[PDB]
Amino acid sequence: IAIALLLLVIFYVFAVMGTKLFAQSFPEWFGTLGASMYTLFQVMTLESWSMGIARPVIEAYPWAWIYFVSFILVSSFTVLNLFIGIIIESMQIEQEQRAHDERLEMLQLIRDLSSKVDRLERRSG
Amino acid sequence: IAWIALLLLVIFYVFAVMGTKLFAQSFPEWFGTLGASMYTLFQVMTLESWSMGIARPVIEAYPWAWIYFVSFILVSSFTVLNLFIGIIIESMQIEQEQRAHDERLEMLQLIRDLSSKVDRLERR
Amino acid sequence: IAIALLLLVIFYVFAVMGTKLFAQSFPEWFGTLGASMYTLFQVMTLESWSMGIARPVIEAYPWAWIYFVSFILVSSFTVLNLFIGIIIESMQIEQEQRAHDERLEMLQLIRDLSSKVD
Amino acid sequence: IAIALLLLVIFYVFAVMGTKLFAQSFPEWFGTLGASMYTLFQVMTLESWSMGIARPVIEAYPWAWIYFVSFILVSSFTVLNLFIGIIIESMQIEQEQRAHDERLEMLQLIRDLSSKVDRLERRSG
Numbered sequence: 001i002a003i004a005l006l007l008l009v010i011f012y013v014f015a016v017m018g019t020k021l022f023a024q025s026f027p028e029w030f031g032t033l034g035a036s037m038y039t040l041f042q043v044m045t046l047e048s049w050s051m052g053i054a055r056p057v058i059e060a061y062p063w064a065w066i067y068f069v070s071f072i073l074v075s076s077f078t079v080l081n082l083f084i085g086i087i088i089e090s091m092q093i094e095q096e097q098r099a100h101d102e103r104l105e106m107l108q109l110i111r112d113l114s115s116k117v118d119r120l121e122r123r124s125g
Numbered sequence: 126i127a128w129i130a131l132l133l134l135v136i137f138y139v140f141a142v143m144g145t146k147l148f149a150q151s152f153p154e155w156f157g158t159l160g161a162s163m164y165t166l167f168q169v170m171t172l173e174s175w176s177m178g179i180a181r182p183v184i185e186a187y188p189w190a191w192i193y194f195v196s197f198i199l200v201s202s203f204t205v206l207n208l209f210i211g212i213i214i215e216s217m218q219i220e221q222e223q224r225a226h227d228e229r230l231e232m233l234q235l236i237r238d239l240s241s242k243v244d245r246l247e248r249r
Numbered sequence: 250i251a252i253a254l255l256l257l258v259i260f261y262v263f264a265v266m267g268t269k270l271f272a273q274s275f276p277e278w279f280g281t282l283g284a285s286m287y288t289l290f291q292v293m294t295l296e297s298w299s300m301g302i303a304r305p306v307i308e309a310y311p312w313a314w315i316y317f318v319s320f321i322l323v324s325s326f327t328v329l330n331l332f333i334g335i336i337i338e339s340m341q342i343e344q345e346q347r348a349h350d351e352r353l354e355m356l357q358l359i360r361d362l363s364s365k366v367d
Numbered sequence: 368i369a370i371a372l373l374l375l376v377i378f379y380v381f382a383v384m385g386t387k388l389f390a391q392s393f394p395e396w397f398g399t400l401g402a403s404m405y406t407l408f409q410v411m412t413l414e415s416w417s418m419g420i421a422r423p424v425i426e427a428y429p430w431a432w433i434y435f436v437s438f439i440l441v442s443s444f445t446v447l448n449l450f451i452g453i454i455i456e457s458m459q460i461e462q463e464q465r466a467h468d469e470r471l472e473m474l475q476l477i478r479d480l481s482s483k484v485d486r487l488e489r490r491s492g
């Protein structure tokens with residue numbers, strides 16, 4: 001699962017970028033982290049990300065063409081890997097070492113017996 | 126998995142009663158009653174115009190809600206993450222594992238029996 | 250996989266319902282199967298299903314409150330089961346049965362030793 | 368995983384179609400690959416694909432009824448198969464022969480004991 005960190009870096013970073021870039025023009029979505037976070041959560045969610053944010057951004061900032069497309073990909077490519085990361089961390093460790101406690105003592109037991117039958121081998125001398 | 130089914134129907138239930146408490150004054154449309162707060166939260170659950178269409182417009186008068194929506198979404202998707210995957214595991218489908226701790230944990234018993242049988246014939 | 254049928258029944262049926270119901274008021278989305286199919290594909294997709302279709306429907310038809318919510322659920326619950334239906338239809342020794350030839354004879358050996366007895 | 372190619376063909380192709388078709392009427396979304404790529408990414412994303420693009424296209428091009436519905440299906444059916452393609456690939460040692468070092472010597476030990484008891488039960492009557 002924890003990516004969870006990475007994701008909260010990506011999420012963190014992209015916001016600070018956006019708030020740097022756009023906040024001048026788009027204080028609505030990008031004036032502060034306060035809304036850049038939301039906005040990128042909203043973009044993460046795919047609720048009116050282009051038609052509602054990106055295209056309208058890009059109407060004055062063509063460079064953002066990538067900022068939105070990128071973040072979406074990057075985001076979904078880590079949530080691809082975290083959603084599947086809990087598919088594997090749910091599908092199974094321990095069954096190994098409890099029968100090396102048995103066997104590596106059962107052996108010890110037979111050495112004990114062998115020197116107890118052999119203690120009555122010393123036993124006649 | 127369907128232990129969650131309950132939980133989810135609590136989350137779903139609860140969040141609605143909150144919203145209907147909060148917003149219904151301002152947003153009777155989406156929040157006037159459970160009747161529509163249930164829908165609305167289903168709709169927010171669905172991610173069809175949740176922010177642009179509900180939340181941001183809520184938040185225009187209630188900055189409080191900033192979390193109410195973001196939260197519910199997360200909470201919801203994190204239980205449906207776990208229920209959808211809960212049906213991935215409840216669908217997917219051995220014994221010889223505990224059958225060699227029945228061997229070893231009796232083979233041991235056998236060597237103790239021998240050790241007190243070799244030891245039983247030591248006194249003699 | 251083939252549910253594929255069922256789904257195409259659900260999908261089929263719900264359209265014929267909607268086109269019966271709404272087409273009067275909402276010929277836009279429901280005037281014919283032609284657009285009721287699309288519309289229900291669009292509702293299946295969760296692109297402006299409520300805000301864009303359902304709520305606006307329901308503004309004159311409160312009965313639809315279920316028609317949309319229902320279809321969505323029903324749909325996702327069959328696509329839940331078909332997408333997972335391809336997760337299972339897609340997921341396609343002696344080292345374990347040997348250590349019960351060593352052990353179930355090593356035992357025999359210790360019984361043989363133990364019947365070392367006067 | 369790599370479909371990744373196929374997908375980038377589908378994605379590529381459909382854009383060139385759309386840009387052929389619509390870029391007369393809808394230079395907005397279809398004037399160049401530049402925006403037909405985005406647009407098809409946006410349609411891939413299911414953010415206002417019909418209500419925002421397709422229906423509005425189709426208001427003048429009933430042809431497109433399929434172009435959108437098709438691409439969506441085709442897209443999601445390859446991403447169905449690539450997302451599940453990573454459920455099987457990045458999802459799905461030695462202790463095996465380490466307990467035949469134990470067992471195939473523990474046996475040796477019991478033969479050693481058996482000829483050691485053979486030693487002294489013989490050697491004590």
Ligand SMILES: [Ca+2]
Nearest residue numbers: 172173295296
């Ligand atoms: Ca949507």
